[PDB]
């Protein structure tokens, strides 16, 4: 590469030197994508090599085998793994794609074209040509729309996707007639982010999942066409900063928001993130504890409708802030839990006291007890559950992992968006290097006092 | 010495050899700071890897038993030892080193050598400030960490029952010490500790603010995009625009600094004052003289069964510390408490 | 030519001539934090007791109900509501709003908007005055800590009752139950944060000592020694070299902080990144990632448990576990 | 060395030190009033 005196950038800012070398920039990008699929394939292969079939799949600390298993590849009508060959072939394909992508990245990083306008005008670009930048954005939007539509095609015609809400305890369900109601989808995207509505995480069925995917793929394709055949409006030019630093900052803000969304999804979602593959969420393993001690104490012969616990509220049942019947324990905050093994137990009145007394199925019993034992506690050094507990079990919840790691990544990426946004604004304005020292703007205005 | 004859003796030769420019300077304090500090760090490192604490505390606090960096600690002697200096030649060890260990003697060795090493380190700062002919504001600042060291590792065990109640040189033992003051002393509620917390938090605030403001108002001073290459010690002009910084913080915060001297003296003053206030509070707790309770709130809680606040909750959690933790932390006191008299509420 | 109303409005908003710069981030500055501060003052003065834990056990928290400012605290939102966004209009009455902990949600949400807009306003004044803008990036650490303690921990644990009480003794209670349920003291991110504030105090004292030490005679024992020259001169002769020489001769002469720019960059970044680390540690605690649990880890050849400092810390942790939220439990093990 | 004192000095308290001292006194007050009232 080059050195500091010809670029003004130190070694710890060396990738800034690629701000104008588009060929080396795309080479670094494709080598990076090769790194991403290399981690994907290597983790698939290692995780299959370290896989135990009879033990349920969320107890080995498994984060992306549930990602394939949610798609319905190699899983039975109860979350049983049966075969791991789909996972194996996915990992091997990712490894080979990593090899070819890394080859391309190394080639363009070393003996690729230094600059692209002198050889490839279709790939040549500056950071100021709004039409060309929107053309690239349109190409990527078309690719992402095709990627979402590929999942739509799989869920529709390819015999996949694991419905945890299927009767019996979840099954690989072929989704027919997904709900593409614009009112429903927009209501999901504009509802409250709090616990009453959940904004985007409270999606509860594959029909709405695939309908929203249809909507996103459709708008992504049409927006790709729109950005290819258009040029930004004057209000967009006046409101935006058009440079490579600014574009990076906008992308960093968007991907940090995405990281926070994924953190909340991994912690709270139970439909797109099956509990059979990821362990219990936040509300369950506590609502599961409540329901299990409810059914145990009604089996021992007590009257759970009596309850009337230590504070005069109810050891098992309680009325929520609204008139629905909910659990009376300390899990009275999670009463908005909707899970597969409570909904046939739940009706318009509440928790359906008669169904609590009579209609409780043994699969619901077993699922609730198992979700009690494997709570989403766990400590960072493995070890057991609560921080006061001891070295008894080796289990940390993959939901806890995918929440903590993704919050950390999202927070640093919000910080990185702030850094690059401020630097892009200061670079476009010119005073990124500092104050000019011969005409400082402070002496250009009157003093405050 | 005032244009006198000043006949040269061995002292002048020794001073001439000590005040020399080397890789590491020695000076007069090198007669004390170097051996005392090297012995302190070596004693702590040796006790954290081999010297067990099975005899005194009934626990493992060394790497040779199954402990990590966050678990091993050079532990204090037993409470029955009281406040002995606990020499290897004293009535305790009677000249035997292999049993001078596992009896808390290495803790006293490390503590005394560390105290004298801190003494030598302030003498170090003083005499180097003399050699460079600058004011010893560094020693002025360093007077506070050693005040904390004395008030914590000497004054507090000296005023309490013995070295056993001092912090052991480690990590998790320090955490035990922290929870010990939490439950047994309610050290958060002590106003001097509140001052110490305010001083440290304000000092970190000043650190971040000063660094960010100087690094964001540092002028151009060149043509390269890297600002660090634009600094030159040969020029006498200031690196950053203090008038720009003052205007920025005046329009953001409402108040801003106008004098570099007052800025840096504030950065000097806040942690020193906070640490001295915390040292005074620990001197208060050395005599078991606590800011433990509020009379009006405890009387109101006693005569009102439905009036409760976070202070009452804190008192209850302190009782949780004492009842469930003194039984194992004080093996000399022999707490064979039945676990139906310990305060333990619903389910948990 | 600014003869239209909204052009003059954007000029007055954008202008730096006001005593306090408002800005386009300032238009969300002023109303949000005045709303939060008004509700905070009124609640702290005369709020009725707030049912925090949802078991009809209210915490008084307000001075007029019989506590001082040390033990007084704006109590968190109720456990019954959870993180369900309950504002005044969702309450049937102001009394019900005050009983279920509505002012806590009000102040916390408005304070979160206020701190994000204070970040943006710092950047905005940096832009209008033409400096470098990363002062907001440095301030991104205490705001990260504030969000982690105020909204992210309630999001992770499921209810705003889990958040920090707006007070002092409530802060102590939240911290203690935090140690009880998460073992924060034995977490590397928390150790990084503690090291960061300790090093912040150390480096602040060290920088103040090295700058105030490296001075020349211009202010004598009197107010000012201006007899050589009064105010109105640009002669910069404070000191440039002796502070770095002292710092080199202190230990080994190769800790090169001759570059004052590099010195100030490190001085800024060390406590900022460490508070970033501890804020992320608290956010991870929200999702029950907990601390190092080396309890019963030391065993002899017979497998019998050998006690340790970690076991003592574990005993204290369970002692705070069995006391907090006195009558909130029904079921044995504690799940969020 | 004579009848008037050449060592006489006048006291100077600027507004910044005024505000800092007042803030110091009232912060000590809010810290210790709750404890003296007890």
């Amino acid at each position: 590469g080059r050195d500091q005196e010809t670029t003004g950038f130190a070694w710890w800012a060396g990738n800034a030197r690629l701000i104008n070398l588009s060929g080396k920039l795309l080479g670094a990008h494709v080598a990076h994508a090769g790194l991403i699929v290399f981690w994907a394939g290597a983790m698939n292969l290692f995780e299959v090599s370290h896989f135990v079939p009879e033990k349920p799949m969320y107890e080995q600390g498994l984060i992306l085998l549930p990602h394939i298993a949610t798609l319905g590849y190699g899983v039975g009508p109860g979350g049983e793994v049966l075969d791991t060959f789909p996972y194996f072939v996915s990992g091997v394909l990712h490894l080979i794609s990593s090899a070819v992508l890394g080859f391309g990245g190394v080639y363009h990083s070393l003996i690729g074209p230094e600059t692209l306008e002198e050889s490839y005008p279709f790939f040549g670009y500056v950071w100021k040509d709004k039409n060309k930048m929107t053309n690239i954005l349109g190409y990527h939007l078309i690719i992402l729309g095709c990627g979402a539509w590929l999942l739509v095609l799989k869920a529709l015609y390819f015999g996949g996707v694991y419905d945890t809400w299927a009767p019996g305890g979840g099954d690989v369900r072929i989704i027919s007639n997904p709900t593409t109601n614009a009112a429903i989808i927009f209501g999901y995207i504009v509802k409250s982010p709090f616990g009453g509505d959940g904004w985007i995480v409270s999606v509860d069925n594959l029909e709405d999942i695939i309908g929203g995917h249809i909507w996103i793929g459709t708008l992504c394709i049409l927006g790709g066409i729109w950005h290819i055949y258009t040029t930004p409006w004057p209000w967009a030019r006046r409101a935006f900063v058009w440079s490579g630093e600014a574009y990076l900052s906008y992308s960093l803000a968007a991907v940090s928001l995405m990281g926070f969304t994924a953190c909340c999804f991994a912690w709270f979602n139970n439909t797109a993130y099956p509990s059979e593959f990821y362990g219990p969420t936040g509300p369950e393993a506590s609502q599961a504890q409540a329901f299990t001690f409810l059914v145990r104490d009604q089996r021992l012969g007590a009257n759970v409708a009596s309850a009337q616990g230590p504070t005069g509220l109810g050891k098992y049942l309680m009325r929520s802030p609204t008139g629905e019947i909910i659990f009376g324990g300390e899990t009275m905050r999670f009463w908005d839990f909707r899970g597969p093994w409570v909904e046939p137990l739940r009706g318009p009145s509440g928790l359906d006291l008669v169904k609590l007394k009579n209609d409780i199925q043994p699969w619901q019993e077993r699922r609730a007890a198992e979700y009690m034992t494997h709570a989403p506690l766990g400590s960072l050094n493995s070890v057991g559950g609560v921080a006061t507990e001891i070295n008894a079990v080796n289990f940390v919840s993959p939901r806890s992992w995918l929440a903590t790691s993704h919050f950390c990544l999202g927070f640093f990426f919000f910080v990185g968006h702030l850094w690059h946004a401020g630097r892009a604004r200061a670079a476009a304005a010119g005073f990124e290097k500092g104050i000019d020292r011969v005409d400082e703007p402070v002496l250009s205005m009157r003093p405050l006092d | 010495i005032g244009t006198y004859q000043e006949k040269r003796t061995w002292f002048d030769d020794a001073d001439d050899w000590l005040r020399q420019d080397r890789f590491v300077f020695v000076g007069w304090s090198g007669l004390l700071l170097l051996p005392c500090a090297y012995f302190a760090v070596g004693g702590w490192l040796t006790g954290c890897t081999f010297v067990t604490s099975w005899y005194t505390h009934g626990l493992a606090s060394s790497y040779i038993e199954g402990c990590n960096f966050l678990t091993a600690a050079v532990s204090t002697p037993a409470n029955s030892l009281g406040h002995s200096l606990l020499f290897v030649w004293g009535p305790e060890a009677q000249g035997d080193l292999t049993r001078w260990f596992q009896l808390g003697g290495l803790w006293a060795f490390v503590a005394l050598h560390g105290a004298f090493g801190l003494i030598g380190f302030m003498l170090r700062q003083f005499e180097i400030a003399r050699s460079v002919n600058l004011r010893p504001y560094n020693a002025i600042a360093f007077s506070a960490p050693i005040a904390v060291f004395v008030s914590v590792f000497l004054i507090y065990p000296l005023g309490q029952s013995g070295w056993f109640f001092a912090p052991s040189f480690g990590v998790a033992s320090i955490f035990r010490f922290i929870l010990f003051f939490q439950g047994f002393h309610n050290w958060t509620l002590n106003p001097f500790h509140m001052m110490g917390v305010a001083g440290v938090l304000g000092a970190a605030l000043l650190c971040a603010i000063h660094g960010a403001t100087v690094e964001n108002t540092l002028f151009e001073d060149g043509d390269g995009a890297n600002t660090f290459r634009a600094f030159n010690p040969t020029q006498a002009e200031e690196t950053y625009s203090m008038v720009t910084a003052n205007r920025f913080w005046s329009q953001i915060f409402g108040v801003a600094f106008s004098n570099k001297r007052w800025l840096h003296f504030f950065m000097l003053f806040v942690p020193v004052t906070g640490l001295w206030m915390s040292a005074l509070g620990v001197v208060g707790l050395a005599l078991n003289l606590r800011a433990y309770d509020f009379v009006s709130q405890e009387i109101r809680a006693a005569e009102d069964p439905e009036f409760e606040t976070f202070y009452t909750k804190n008192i209850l959690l302190n009782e949780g510390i004492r009842a469930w933790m003194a039984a194992q932390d004080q093996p000399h006191e022999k707490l064979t408490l039945p676990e139906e008299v310990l305060p333990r509420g619903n389910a948990l | 030519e600014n003869t239209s109303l909204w052009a003059r409005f954007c000029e007055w908003i954008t202008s730096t001539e006001n005593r306090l710069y408002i800005g386009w981030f300032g238009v969300i500055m002023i109303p949000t934090l005045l709303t939060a501060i008004s509700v905070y003052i009124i609640a702290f003065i005369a709020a009725p007791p707030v049912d925090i834990d949802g078991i009809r056990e209210p915490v008084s928290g307000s001075l007029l109900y019989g506590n001082n400012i040390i033990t007084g605290a704006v109590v968190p939102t109720s456990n019954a509501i959870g993180l369900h966004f309950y504002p005044i209009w969702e309450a049937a009455s102001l009394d019900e709003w005050l009983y279920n902990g509505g002012p806590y949600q009000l102040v916390v949400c408005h304070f979160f908007l206020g701190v994000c807009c204070y970040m943006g306003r710092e950047w905005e004044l940096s832009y209008r005055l033409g400096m470098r803008p990363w002062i907001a990036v440095a301030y991104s650490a205490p705001v990260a800590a504030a969000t982690a303690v105020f909204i992210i921990y309630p999001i992770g644990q499921g209810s705003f009752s889990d958040g920090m009480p707006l007070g002092i003794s409530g802060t102590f209670n939240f911290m203690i139950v935090f140690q009880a349920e998460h073992n924060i003291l034995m977490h590397p991110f928390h150790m990084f944060g503690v090291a960061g504030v300790f090093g912040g105090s150390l480096f602040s004292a060290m920088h103040g000592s090295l700058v105030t030490s490296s001075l020349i005679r211009e202010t004598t024992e009197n107010e000012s020694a201006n007899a050589g020259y009064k105010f109105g001169q640009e002669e910069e002769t404070y000191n440039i070299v002796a502070a770095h020489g002292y710092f080199g001769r202190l230990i080994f002469q190769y800790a090169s902080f001759n570059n004052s720019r590099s010195l100030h960059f490190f001085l800024a970044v060390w406590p900022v990144v460490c508070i970033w680390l501890t804020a992320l540690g608290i956010s991870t605690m929200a999702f029950n990632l907990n601390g190092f649990n080396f309890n019963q880890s030391v065993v002899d050849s017979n497998g019998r448990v050998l006690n340790t400092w970690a076991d003592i810390i574990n005993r204290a942790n369970l002692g705070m576990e069995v006391m907090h939220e006195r009558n909130a439990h029904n079921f044995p093990l504690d799940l969020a | 060395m004579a009848r008037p004192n050449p060592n006489k000095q006048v006291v100077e308290l600027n507004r910044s030190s005024l505000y800092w001292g007042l803030l110091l006194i009232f912060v000590l007050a809010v810290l210790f009033s709750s404890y003296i009232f007890n």
Partner: peptide
Amino acid sequence: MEALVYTFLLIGTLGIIFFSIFFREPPRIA
């Protein structure tokens, strides 16, 4: 008068910081 004295002290702190923000001495020497 239990709460009123803390009220006086808090109002005094707020008044002092308000006066320090607005009725401050102007920043001289740079």
